[PDB]
Design a binder for these strands. Structure first.
Lengths: 48, 58, 203, 121, 119
RNA sequence: GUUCUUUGUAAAGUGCCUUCGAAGAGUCGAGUUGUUUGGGAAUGCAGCUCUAAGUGGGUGGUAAAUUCCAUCUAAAGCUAA
RNA sequence: UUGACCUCAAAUCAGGUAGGAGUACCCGCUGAACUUAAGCAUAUCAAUAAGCGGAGGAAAAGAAACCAACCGGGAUUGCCUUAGUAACGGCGAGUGAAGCGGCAAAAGCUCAAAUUUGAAAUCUGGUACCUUCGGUGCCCGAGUUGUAAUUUGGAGAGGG
């Protein structure tokens, strides 16, 4: 919450880094079910 | 002056903030108004009592 | 909004209105004991913004701290050393009188915890402070989890270890290149930077 | 607008009411039993050769009494066990870490038939 | 074998008190004849009997005291469990687990969710 | 995983327009003295004297004047690995 | 004469807390000299040892009044490197830090300053009950010189 952005390609990279991430994860519903998802130990490794 | 102070507080005696005695008794009717009329806190008459608080009066 | 007025009015300490009060207050404090119970906070605006809450459990004490410098306790002025540290009368001590105010008050009542302090008055001989303390064994502070941290044992005698506002300033712990000697503890930074670290595999 | 007359020239605390005690619970729950009962006072009679010949002539019994006991607590413990009164009690501390007591019963009894009836003679 | 442990548990309060003087007297007798001959190992087996009956009185007497204070607060200090000084001090689980109004509103509204990566 | 309440006309989050938006004082800072620092026309601290400001204050570590820029918000507080 | 406010007190008043021990690590205060300078007065030893106060399983620090000036980064802590370096020093002996970079661990936040004023909605205590590390009912007290909710600056508040 304490850094501002001044480059478009840096903003584009970070915005693209969130759109791709949200499409590659599943959020387990609060209700129930949600079977095991074979967790991956590292998140930064999957996104170089 | 003594006369002014007596007259001033005599007006105050006619306008007193609600104590726990009346504060308890209203909520029965207020809940009864809620239970029966479902009023939006308007069944009771408008307050005209004196105010309190140094951070309030300022 | 009656608290913005006491702040700005108190900021004009040299005003004629304040000069009358301070002379009256200093006489009242002097005739009392060095440390005694402060029944009501004389500066509600200052205490309120320092963490004090005017509710059940909080108490105030008033303390008079002797004014001046720290003369060495050496006998007859002899220092028995190199001609470098031969001075006795012109040493200035390393903590503010505010820190001593907490120490002498936080030690008289051990059942309490020192929260903060502030300047109230002063004269040629003394510096007056009023210290706000909390009681962690009181059920009011035990509940109302906003102030549960004062009940933790790790906050035992906070001012004795210099963890208060004046404590963090007297020992000078702050962010910035202006504070590199003391940024994470003067001794700890020294030991961290003055030591020989030998690994298993000497590169 | 009125001030009380003061015969004295000094101020003193008025004698207020000293409130009594009313704890919510007992101090130590059950009280301790009798630490020095009639039996721990008298532990074992002395049977030495020199003590024995004092029984027959002076009508004096010798016991290894408890250290904490005193002649007030000796004169009553012995008369409750052996139902014999005591003329006087003389008590010394033995140099081995124990306490000795000479109990001289009154002329109405003799120690000879009392010493043997408890077992030692 | 002296006396046993659980047999005298069923004994009444008055009967146990009279049991001491029964043991207490015979100790005064065993001292008298112990000096007579230099062998008496029977004194040990029943001096452990006087202690057993004394112990049973306290466990029965403390139970009655404890039952009197059940339901109400401020029980006697020794009845309270010892723990350590630090554990007896500090915050109870209710006091520590308590949270303020604002932070609680955030907690239910925004809990920490669980997730993973599949594709 | 199974279980009884459903706590609630209560609480929380999102777009749009307008008006506001309070933010810590003997403190900041300056001189001087002493100590410390690698801190060098003064690194930090402490004593005394003076002692404020608001599109203000601190910093941009050779002083000073004039005019710009960048940077964050002090003098209150809690927190595991 | 009666009844309230403020201040100061009394008791073997009800309920609590603090002292001491250990100090290996941790937080500060105070604080030398031997020695090096092949003499010795600045210096170094050393912001050390001794002395003092204070805690925990870790302590401390910790969400910038930061570093940078770069296409800027972004709580704190520890390792490698920066670096025997900038700098300090009878510029002699000697002392000598920080930014950036890679790694380990990753976490955030909270008050005051805003009239809820058609509602002190806040809290302790005592008493009674109970599905009793707590909850409910009732009653004396703290409290508006201010207690809850609401926002703390990344924002956010009042209206539509």
């Amino acid at each position: 919450h304490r850094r501002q952005n001044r480059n478009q390609e840096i903003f584009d990279a970070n915005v693209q880094r969130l759109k791709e991430y949200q499409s590659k994860i599943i959020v387990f519903p609060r209700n129930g079910k949600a079977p095991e998802a074979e967790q991956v130990l590292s998140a930064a490794a999957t996104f170089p | 002056d003594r006369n002014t102070a007596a007259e001033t507080f005599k007006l105050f005696n006619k306008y007193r903030p609600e104590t726990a005695a009346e504060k308890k008794e209203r909520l029965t009717k207020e809940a009864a108004a809620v239970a029966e009329g479902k009023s939006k806190q308007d069944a009771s008459p408008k307050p005209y009592a004196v105010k309190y608080g140094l951070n309030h009066v300022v | 909004g009656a608290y913005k007025y006491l702040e700005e009015l108190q900021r004009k300490k040299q005003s004629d209105v304040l000069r009358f009060l301070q002379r009256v207050r200093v006489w009242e404090y002097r005739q009392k004991n060095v440390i005694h119970r402060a029944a009501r906070p004389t500066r509600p605006d200052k205490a309120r913004r320092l963490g004090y809450k005017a509710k059940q459990g909080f108490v105030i004490y008033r303390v008079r701290v002797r004014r001046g410098n720290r003369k060495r306790p050496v006998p007859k002025g002899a220092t028995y050393g190199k001609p470098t540290n031969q001075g006795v009368n012109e040493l200035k001590y390393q903590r503010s009188l505010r820190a001593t105010a907490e120490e002498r008050v936080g030690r008289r009542a051990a059942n309490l915890r020192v929260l903060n302090s502030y300047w109230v008055n002063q004269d040629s001989t003394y510096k007056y402070f009023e210290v706000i303390l909390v009681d962690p064994q009181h059920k009011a502070i035990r509940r109302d989890a906003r102030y549960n941290w004062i009940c933790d044992p790790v906050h035992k005698h906070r001012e004795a270890r210099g963890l208060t506002a004046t404590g963090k300033k007297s020992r000078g712990i702050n962010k910035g290149h202006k504070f590199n000697n003391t940024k994470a503890g003067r001794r700890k930074t020294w030991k961290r930077q003055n030591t020989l670290s030998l690994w298993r595999y000497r590169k | 607008k009125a001030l009380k007359v003061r015969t004295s020239a000094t101020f003193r605390l008025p004698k207020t009411l000293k409130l009594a005690r009313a704890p919510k619970y007992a101090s130590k729950a059950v009280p301790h039993y009798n630490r020095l009962d009639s039996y721990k006072v008298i532990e074992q009679p002395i049977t030495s050769e020199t003590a024995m010949k004092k029984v027959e002539d002076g009508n004096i019994l010798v016991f290894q009494v408890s250290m904490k006991a005193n002649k007030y607590q000796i004169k009553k413990a012995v008369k409750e066990l052996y139902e014999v009164d005591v003329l006087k009690v003389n008590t010394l501390v033995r140099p081995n870490g124990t306490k000795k007591a000479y109990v001289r019963l009154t002329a109405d009894y003799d120690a000879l038939d009392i010493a043997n009836r408890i077992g030692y003679i | 074998a002296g006396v046993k442990a659980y047999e005298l548990r069923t004994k009444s309060k008055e009967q146990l008190a009279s049991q001491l003087v029964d043991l207490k007297k015979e100790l005064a007798e065993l001292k008298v004849q112990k000096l007579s001959r230099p062998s008496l190992p029977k004194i040990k087996t029943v001096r452990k009997s006087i202690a057993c009956v004394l112990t049973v009185i306290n466990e029965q007497q403390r139970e009655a005291v404890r039952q009197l204070y059940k339901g109400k607060k401020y029980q006697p200090k020794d009845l309270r469990a010892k723990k350590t000084r630090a554990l007896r001090r500090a915050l109870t689980k209710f006091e520590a687990s308590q949270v303020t109004e604002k932070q609680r509103k955030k907690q239910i509204a925004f809990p920490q969710r669980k997730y993973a990566i599949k594709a």
